[PDB]
Amino acid sequence: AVGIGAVF
Amino acid sequence: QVQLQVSGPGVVRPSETLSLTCEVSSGSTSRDFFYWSWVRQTPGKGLEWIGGMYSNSEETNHNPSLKSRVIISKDTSKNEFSLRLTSVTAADTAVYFCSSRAKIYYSASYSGGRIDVWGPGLLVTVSSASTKGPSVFPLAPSSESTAALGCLVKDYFPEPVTVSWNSGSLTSGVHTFPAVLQSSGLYSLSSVVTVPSSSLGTQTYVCNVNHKPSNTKVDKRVEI
Amino acid sequence: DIQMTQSPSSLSASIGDRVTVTCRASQGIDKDLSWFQQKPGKAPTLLIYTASTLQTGVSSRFSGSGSGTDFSLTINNLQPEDVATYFCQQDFSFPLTFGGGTKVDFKRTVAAPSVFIFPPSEDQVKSGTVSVVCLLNNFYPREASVKWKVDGALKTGNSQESVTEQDSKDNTYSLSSTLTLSSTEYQSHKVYACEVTHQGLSSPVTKSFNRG
Secondary structure, eight states, rough: SSSOEEEE | OOTTOOSSSSEEEETTTTEEEOOOOSSSTTTTEEEEEEEEETTTTTEEEEEEETTTTOOOOOOOGGGGGEEEEEEEEGGGGEEEEOOGGGOOOEEEEEEEEEEEEEOOSOOEEEEEEEEOEEEEEEOOOBOOEEEEEOOOOOOOSEEEEEEEEEEEEESOOOOEEETTTOOOOOOOOOOOOOTTEEEEEEEEEETTTTTHHHHHOOEEEETTTTTTTEEEEOOO | OEEEEESSSEEEETTOEEEEEEEEEOOTTTTTEEEEEEETTSSEEEEEEETEEEOOOOOOTTEEEEEETTEEEEOOOOEEEEEEEEEEEEOOSSSOEOOOEEEEEEEOBBBBBEEEEOOOOHHHTSSSSEEEEEEEEEEEEOEEEEEEEEEEEGGGGGEEEEEEEOOOTOHHHHEEEEEEHHHHHHOOOOOOEEEEOOTTTTSSSEEEEEEE
8 A cells, every 4th residue: 555654 | 623624715717726734634643644645636537636645754656647736734733734735726626625644554454454544535627707796597397297497506606505495495396406617717506496387376486595605595486 | 656447437226236346457456455435525434455354333234245357346235325436445555456347327217307408598698608497307327318309419518517416216217418619609599409319219309499
């Protein structure tokens, strides 16, 4: 996947 | 403003710079980072991803069709994710959205999922037309059981107009069509209602048009 | 770039039907494909991601399959909230690209349109531009052909159409065809007719009037 962040 | 709600001018003159902001927030942990995107929607071209960036970084990704006209920025001080589209033309008239994309790594028991959310869009029209209130013309009946009557809301700019019948009292059987841009650069639509013909004697029929950009209200009684 | 072709562009179905939209990428997008639902006034809402993963909160009536080049979205127990447009979104590479979209519409019994024509009032003629309005009310299906004949000559190119969304209670459509001329060609001609063809009509229905 491109252009996607991460939340924790 | 709700999350990812877009704000900015709804009308931009050609050759000028469209500038929009988007309501963004920080994550709940200091490790959280999102991918923020500008997307736009037109009737013919459908959906078009304009560009985006990580909240982490200063780097930007673009659409090759737009890249040298797009400036994507962030201002955490104002919780703003911004788009600047220069050299604007009528082809740039669209509804503009913001999206936020992030994979979910909350836990060893909840992971791999994702958030991909869009906020409410904003219609931006590109034209040199001046703000003008609409002209409202009654569409009067020319058989049995039902007759149709209506109102033609012509030669106004910009969008939108709200149309009610009998001050909002009449809503059943009302069809207000999407506005259409006419060659003169002004919008035009019709609002029609079918009523029992027996009621033509009994019932008064008034269309009320509200155009907030020109601060105009028009009330037009529709008679035979 | 990578483009997604969706099929069909439009789809009409009944309550309980199992319906399928197909999307293909111009190249392998291994699994990086999402399905969104858009109601007419709202922003697109995520349904499926990684081509088969149901997003939390979305009903299991929505399912996704496919890989590589070919992908499908299936809506199984079609419900009234499913009337909307459905898009595929490729996130395999920049730029992100979307399919053209697929409308899901509700089947109902065929309804022929009720045709009315509204001639311009005194005021419109003196405004420099006249609009003659032809209304097609409460018909199904959405496909309809409206022609304009002025003194027996086709002038449909000077008209344009505007259609409502599907009504939530009768599942019909309404269409307006507005013929806009200047006051000078409008006063140059006498008979104004709009001719409607629709599958609920055995023969075309023409509504006409004489200027003045």
